[PDB]
Write a protein that binds this ligand. Sequence first.
Ligand SMILES: C#CCN1CC[C@H](Oc2ccc(C)c(C)c2)[C@@H](O)C1
Ligand SMILES: C#CCN1CC[C@H](Oc2ccc(C)c(C)c2)[C@@H](O)C1
Ligand SMILES: C#CCN1CC[C@H](Oc2ccc(C)c(C)c2)[C@@H](O)C1
Ligand SMILES: C#CCN1CC[C@H](Oc2ccc(C)c(C)c2)[C@@H](O)C1
Ligand SMILES: [Zn+2]
Ligand SMILES: [Zn+2]
Ligand SMILES: [Zn+2]
Ligand SMILES: [Zn+2]
Lengths: 360, 360
Amino acid sequence: MASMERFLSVYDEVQAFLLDQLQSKYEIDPNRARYLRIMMDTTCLGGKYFRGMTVVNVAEGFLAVTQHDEATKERILHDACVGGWMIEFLQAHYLVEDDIMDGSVMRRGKPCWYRFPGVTTQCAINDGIILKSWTQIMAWHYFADRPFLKDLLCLFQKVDYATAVGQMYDVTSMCDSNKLDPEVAQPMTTDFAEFTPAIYKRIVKYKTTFYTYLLPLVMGLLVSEAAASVEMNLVERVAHLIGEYFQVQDDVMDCFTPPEQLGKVGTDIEDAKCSWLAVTFLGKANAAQVAEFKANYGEKDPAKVAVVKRLYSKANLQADFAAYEAEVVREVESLIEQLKVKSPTFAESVAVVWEKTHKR
Amino acid sequence: MASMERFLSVYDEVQAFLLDQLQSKYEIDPNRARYLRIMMDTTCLGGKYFRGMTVVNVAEGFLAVTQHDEATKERILHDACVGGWMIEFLQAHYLVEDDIMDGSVMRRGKPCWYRFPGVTTQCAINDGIILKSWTQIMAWHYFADRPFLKDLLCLFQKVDYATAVGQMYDVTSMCDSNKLDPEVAQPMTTDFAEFTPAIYKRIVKYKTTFYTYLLPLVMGLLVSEAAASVEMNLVERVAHLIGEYFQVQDDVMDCFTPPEQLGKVGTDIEDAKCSWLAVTFLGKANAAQVAEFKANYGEKDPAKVAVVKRLYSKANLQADFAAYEAEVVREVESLIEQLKVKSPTFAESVAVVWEKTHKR
Ligand SMILES: C#CCN1CC[C@H](Oc2ccc(C)c(C)c2)[C@@H](O)C1
Ligand SMILES: C#CCN1CC[C@H](Oc2ccc(C)c(C)c2)[C@@H](O)C1
Ligand SMILES: C#CCN1CC[C@H](Oc2ccc(C)c(C)c2)[C@@H](O)C1
Ligand SMILES: C#CCN1CC[C@H](Oc2ccc(C)c(C)c2)[C@@H](O)C1
Ligand SMILES: [Zn+2]
Ligand SMILES: [Zn+2]
Ligand SMILES: [Zn+2]
Ligand SMILES: [Zn+2]
């Protein structure tokens, strides 16, 4: 059975399981089950499933070099699919809540879940909470007798917490740290002193890399009972490195990729986000260019947003991206080589993850 | 050491642990640690700690009749306090998100967390997510080597999911089930056919009783390694019964308790909530009274809200509450007697939980 096909068939099984359990144990009625079914489909499907499929791809790599009965191969693949959906549902939780938090309009060329006429923020915040609760229901049901259940739940929790901390780093990236105070309305920074590569690296590390790369790779190892085939410090170092490049790609696209291709209108400039473009620009601009940046950043006014985009285009950030990319390619290659010592199989899965990121 | 005193000292220890870990492992800066410290204090403290203290009280009951070394007694009490804080932090998550979802103004006579000038909804939604993540960090750290960790995490997850389902039941309690649709803006019910005792019992069962009564009682049993001293079906039956009475008390207070004593202005009528008052009133009103109810319920207009309150006061719902209360007292007494068969100690803890609920 083809990988994607198996993955999508497991979604249907998981959905039927969750919805039946709501009927048999939670006294749900058909209309509320239908609402939750549509919520699940609208928030979980439509993407590329890169995170979920990485779990499956990692498990597939190990099956090719390990002796198992056919029933065990089927069990491992089914577990990798459930594991993959746990991450997809975790991401769905993040996207639903992030969209509400940011007042976002579109997500994947469709309205944000909370903007659906029969949803509203009052329901959507709770819908987002349910999405994350379902990841745990999945784990406890499907992995009840598995030796990896403990490690898997512990990893999932640590990743989820790191991601929430990352979201806090992201939402507060445009204010002066020394001014943070629940009692006082937060002014946007005027000096941009915290728009540095190391501060940018911290936001990205926590907000994206743990759930997008570390969690699918390690979950693939856990379901395969293969964590001994790797040096965990290398897995962490390669996940953070690929994850950072992925976010740099996200940041560049928000500013220059057409809204129809991106699936929404990018607002990082208006939002005064600490993006790779803002940081890199400030790392090479002259005094006059820094003044022009300060006068126009973090403003809704389309004329001010156009000035910032013009500063980025004239600063030749395309060259800085090419240099950054060459250094990442270099470091990713080094780590893949280091991973080959313990597992050529896992190194290959990482090579495929990198290829899919670099070529997207 | 006095119970409440030990409980509050454990909060300080847990807070120091979480904040230090953010510094040592999550690269947090002092200003963001301070923000999270104030968030923790504002959202977790100020209440009666009834839920957290029930865990402690249950564990204390068993210590009085069980042989242990002094170090083991200290361990059990410390675990009961951490367990109690997990529930208090779970409730803090619920209250933060519920307040945002409802557009609430005050909570415990203070502004809702999201209304703090330096917080806003953009941060508060994520702050609420962090509160729940901290319950898991607590469990994995403090109970790492405990035999009850698995059962405790499994119970906590099931309770959290039931509570989120309950919140969905609550937020949709004023619409017609057959009209629920994410694509269509939801009209408020006109017939109130779903304002029945059994539908009211379902909302209350899931939205409050699992986390307010079942979870503290069972957590007290888990930390004591005493789940064999009880018949779990009785614990579930007594928790649902006390929990329902607690919510009936909440519903009555929202309408008749002064805002200064309640800690907020009650809006159940304006919100068209399926409250015990609305259900009980519709269960005894004549055709003319039902028409007057339909014409005035679920409206912001203070004149319409005053009409509904006048219908409740003239319907003599105080007598219906007295009859309901007498039946609950009767059923709670029966279940306590049934619990005495396996554990007079646990039956006594339940007797104390009931007394604290009935006399509040
Ligand atoms: C793919 C797959 C597996 N499966 C196919 C049947 C069905 O398809 C839908 C339904 C709704 C939405 C919004 C989308 C994108 C797809 C769903 O249950 C998922
Ligand atoms: C890609 C990327 C970076 N990023 C921002 C959008 C979204 O944000 C989160 C993360 C964690 C939490 C707890 C919440 C509520 C939202 C997620 O996709 C992570
Ligand atoms: C009780 C207790 C244990 N402890 C005492 C010191 C300190 O007290 C505060 C601080 C802030 C707020 C808002 C409240 C209500 C109490 C806190 O860390 C908790
Ligand atoms: C008391 C009571 C009844 N109730 C309503 C307020 C609040 O609601 C929740 C519950 C679950 C979830 C997931 C959310 C976001 C909010 C909680 O206190 C339960
Ligand atoms: Zn965001
Ligand atoms: Zn972005
Ligand atoms: Zn509410
Ligand atoms: Zn209430």
